[PDB]
Amino acid sequence: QTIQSIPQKGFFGHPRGLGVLFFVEFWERFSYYGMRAMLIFYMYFAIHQNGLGIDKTTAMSIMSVYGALIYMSSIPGAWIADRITGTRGATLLGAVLIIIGHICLSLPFALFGLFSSMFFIIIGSGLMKPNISNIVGRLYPENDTRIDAGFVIFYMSVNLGALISPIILQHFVDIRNFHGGFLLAAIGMALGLVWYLLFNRKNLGSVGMKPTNPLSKEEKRKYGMIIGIIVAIVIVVLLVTYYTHTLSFDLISNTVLVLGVALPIIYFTTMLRSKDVTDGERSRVKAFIPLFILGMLFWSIQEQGSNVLNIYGLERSDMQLNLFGWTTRFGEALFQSINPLFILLFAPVISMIWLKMGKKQPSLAIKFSIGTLLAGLSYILIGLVGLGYGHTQFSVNWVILSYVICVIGELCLSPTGNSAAVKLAPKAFNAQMMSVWLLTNASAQAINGTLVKLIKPLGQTNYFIFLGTVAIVITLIILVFSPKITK
């Protein structure tokens, strides 16, 4: 028994190990969202401002493609833990790779430093993200009802790190000390790794020390050749295009765009064509197709707050917060703190609205439709402000109001999708259903990598109105099938 080897109390009424992983996940998410908040400005700011001087659209595309690959890397990363290392080994290995990637950005390696950093953080996040979360659930016995509250505490560390790191790193953006700020994130991640190394054995015991489905001798040869050949094809294609001077980021963004649209098709088709899925379960998988489209439309607009809305605010607004006499300069990195702050303050509030309803509360489709409509309206709001003011500089309050309307939509959509990924999941395809709910974000980010290229031809203001309209009309179309989709 893995439960007999660990403490069952010790961290606010939950296993002591939830305390070790809260500290690790806080420091890892602190360094991730800190690095991310700075990265967009580090890329497109001029060389004389200590940036890389990359074209605005290419910097926006790198941000969205980087985010897509982090979520896609969870899929092979969960597999490596399930079949090769176990969840403990993948977490430790993944954490070490994330540290290397942050150190890559602290060094004066310009573009080599940027892409080698992304490479290490993509692989490391894939190995750490799904497996640290798996260990949290395995700390609880089969019939223990504390598990849901345990994850509510676990995901507080995620939003706490996301809130605090842009506030701390705004100083490094202001003085243009990008390397200094990226070293702070590397030191932040090092605290999380040292804490795991000091307290993982006595608090996590034997949980996750070995893979659940180990590979047989023949499978090590089979999967080794297939993976070996895929890693060999990617290396040569990138090397031949580099030395012939025909390698651009368009190669990476187009490959990831294909993966973003191909992966959801492969997963849905497998679950529908399987013989280990009942007629009742097959109808729920069919009913999650329009919900997947709504989730994708939601995450498309929400994730654009890290590379489109913030640059627009920095370039077109006054960047002067002004609320009931409280006026101060609004730092560009602090746009990334609005979303995690409102989740911390209003996630338990919206949770009590549904708990004081029970049967009165709306369906999964109505919650997914409310969320996508609010995300669509947030882009209509800022688009109409740009259209109304034109060349005139408007208040940063309008940009903040856009982020606030989008986070309110996330409070309706994000928890519903987590519950849908487990309730609508077939008995044999639980891990595959967690991948489709995860892919609503990855697919949206893969589309965003190419969707940002429409900003120059359409214009930044029309781009916001077009996306917001597309999101609302498709939501209202899917909303006419709300009684049908409820199965």
Ligand X SMILES: NCC(=O)CCC(=O)O
Binding footprint of ligand X on the chain (CB under 6 A): 33, 158-159, 162, 305, 336, 339-340, 343
Between 100 and 156, whose beta carbon lies closer to ligand X? Answer: 156
Q: From the CB of 29, what's the least distance to ligand X, in Å? A: 7
| 411 within 8 A of 485, measured Cβ to Cβ | no
Between 67 and 113, whose beta carbon lies closer to ligand X? Answer: 67
Residues 6+ apart with CB under 8 A from 208: 81, 86, 87, 88, 89, 91, 131, 134, 135, 138
Between 285 and 406, whose beta carbon lies closer to ligand X? Answer: 406
Q: At what angle do helices 178-204 and 147-174 cross, to 10 degrees?
A: 160
Q: From the CB of 414, what's the least distance to ligand X, in Å? A: 8
Q: From the CB of 94, what's the least distance to ligand X, in Å? A: 18
| 209 within 8 A of 90, measured Cβ to Cβ | no
Between 162 and 252, whose beta carbon lies closer to ligand X? Answer: 162
Between 154 and 268, whose beta carbon lies closer to ligand X? Answer: 154
Q: From the CB of 174, what's the least distance to ligand X, in Å? A: 19
Residue 15: which of 187, 294, 169, 202 has the closest Cα? 202
Q: Tokens 């790193």 identify what position?
A: 169
Between 33 and 172, whose beta carbon lies closer to ligand X? Answer: 33
Q: From the CB of 336, what's the least distance to ligand X, in Å? A: 4
Between 208 and 305, whose beta carbon lies closer to ligand X? Answer: 305
Q: From the CB of 467, what's the least distance to ligand X, in Å? A: 17
Give the integer Cα–Cα distance in Å for 432 and 274.
12
Q: From the CB of 395, what's the least distance to ligand X, in Å? A: 21
Between 334 and 420, whose beta carbon lies closer to ligand X? Answer: 334
Residue 303: which of 54, 58, 67, 38 has the closest Cα? 67
Give the integer Cα–Cα distance in Å for 336 and 165.
9
Beta bridge partners of 328: 321
Q: From the CB of 376, what's the least distance to ligand X, in Å? A: 18
Q: At what angle do helices 87-106 and 16-44 cross, to 10 degrees?
A: 30
Tell me how long the chain is.
Answer: 487
Residue 93: which of 128, 51, 50 has the closest Cα? 128
The DSSP string of 271-306 is HHH-SSS-HHHHHHHHHHHHHHHHHHHHHHHHHGGG
Closest CB to ligand X: residue number: 339
Q: Tokens 């990855």 identify what position?
A: 442
| 407 within 8 A of 449, measured Cβ to Cβ | no
Take residue 68 and report the two structure tokens written for it: 């897509």
Positive/negative CA dihedral, 90, 95, 96, 98? positive
Q: From the CB of 244, what's the least distance to ligand X, in Å? A: 39
Between 20 and 411, whose beta carbon lies closer to ligand X? Answer: 411
Residue 306: which of 13, 32, 98 has the closest Cα? 32
**Cα dist from 247 to 253, 260, 451, whole Å:** 12, 21, 21
Q: Tokens 């999964």 identify what position?
A: 364
Q: From the CB of 410, what's the least distance to ligand X, in Å? A: 7
Q: From the CB of 343, what's the least distance to ligand X, in Å? A: 6
Q: From the CB of 333, what's the least distance to ligand X, in Å? A: 10
Between 161 and 205, whose beta carbon lies closer to ligand X? Answer: 161
| 426 within 8 A of 280, measured Cβ to Cβ | no
Between 208 and 313, whose beta carbon lies closer to ligand X? Answer: 313
Between 290 and 340, whose beta carbon lies closer to ligand X? Answer: 340
**Cα dist from 263 to 82, 234, 269, whole Å:** 20, 18, 10
